[PDB]
């Protein structure tokens, strides 16, 4: 209801894939800070990219975000078998931080 | 930077649950720095809970406010969250991550699984 | 010997628009190039003296005023410009010599939910004279005997908080700003390097 994410995606190993995190809600503000998290099978989520197209030093150079308006297109190039995991989006609304419904990525 | 949660692992219905998150590497004196709490039910999405800034200005989630009073102690670098009236819905994992303005929740801790039932 | 610039630009908490922090900076070998290592300097324009050829000139008495405003109001700190922050709570003369420095800062000023810490006088009676600061927080009138400490036709408190949050557009983000006032006529060089 607050954000919106597709159920799951499965990209063949070695290819690229994009995921969408549409807001589907009016007045989420300017929709400028949208962070993405890597969820392992029972581990603490790790920050992958923050500030749309920006990225924290310490991670790979393949993840890249984008914005088609009201959403955040999380991209993954050179898909490797290591990337099978859960993915989430996160962005404040006027009153409080909200999260995405989750996405599952299994490489086959 | 490092964080670690601790507290009771088991709790009964309609009880006051308490958790203490101790951090190292940063303090609550520099600008921008804050500390928030998040929970995740098994197999469900994460959620926000509250937040304590560095200016002792505190914020809670709208839907579940008027509870979970977040306190702190800057001498031993420890944050305390306490939420009463345990329900079977409240059985989930709990994480304490540090917030900067743009890099929202960039440093998460370990997390402790806690159960709410008879 | 250097003088307080890294204690005027690195302040932890800045004052409000109606409570600017006046200061004097003298007796120092003054280098105006410590600024350039600070920030992208969104707003930087000098009146009466060029910024490039600044480090050499000398001054009589240099005052510095620091406060915080909104995004779309940085234009109002200029000689002779009318508005709502310029005509009500901060006004500088038409013969002003010096310059203004504003750099967007919302990584240290906007909280999730609204930081109700910065205010600004919205109502008053008339315009204010240059560099005239007032703190009074009485309850504004209502034409007739007002609703002093109560509600009614028009009983509106004079101060209003900005309330910054991280969802505001770039026009509504907080901006820190410092104003330097120089003197150049017959000056007994006291602050220059």
Residue numbers in the entry:
A (entry chain C): 2 to 109
B (entry chain A): 2 to 119
C (entry chain B): 334 to 526
Verbatim from the authors:
TH272 tightly binds to BA.4/5 S by hydrophobic interactions and hydrogen bonds, with a buried surface area (BSA) of over 700 Å2. L441, S443, V445, P499, T500, and Y501 of the RBD form strong hydrophobic interactions with G33, L52, W55, and I102 of the heavy chain and V29, G30, Y93, and T94 of the light chain. Extensive hydrogen bonds are formed by Y54, D56, D58, and R60 of the heavy chain and A31, Q33, Y34, and T95 of the light chain, and D56/D58 of HCDR2 form a salt bridge with K444 of the SARS-CoV-2 RBD. TH027 and TH272 belong to the RBD-5 community derived from the IGHV2–5 germline, which engages the SARS-CoV-2 RBD at a neighboring site near the RBM. In contrast to previous work, the HCDR3 of these antibodies harbors a conserved HxTxxT motif, but not the classic HxIxxI27 motif previously reported; consequently, the whole HCDR3 loop does not play a critical role in the antigen-antibody interaction network. Additionally, based on the amino acid sequence alignment analysis, TH027 and TH272 had D at position 54 of HCDR2, which is associated with the IGHV2–5*02 allele. However, TH027 and TH272 were significantly escaped by BQ.1.1 and XBB variants, likely due to the K444T mutation in BQ.1.1 and CH.1.1, which disrupts the salt bridge within the interface. The V445P and G446S mutations in XBB and XBB.1.5 may induce local conformational changes and create steric hindrance, leading to the immune evasion of TH027 and TH272 by XBB or XBB.1.5.
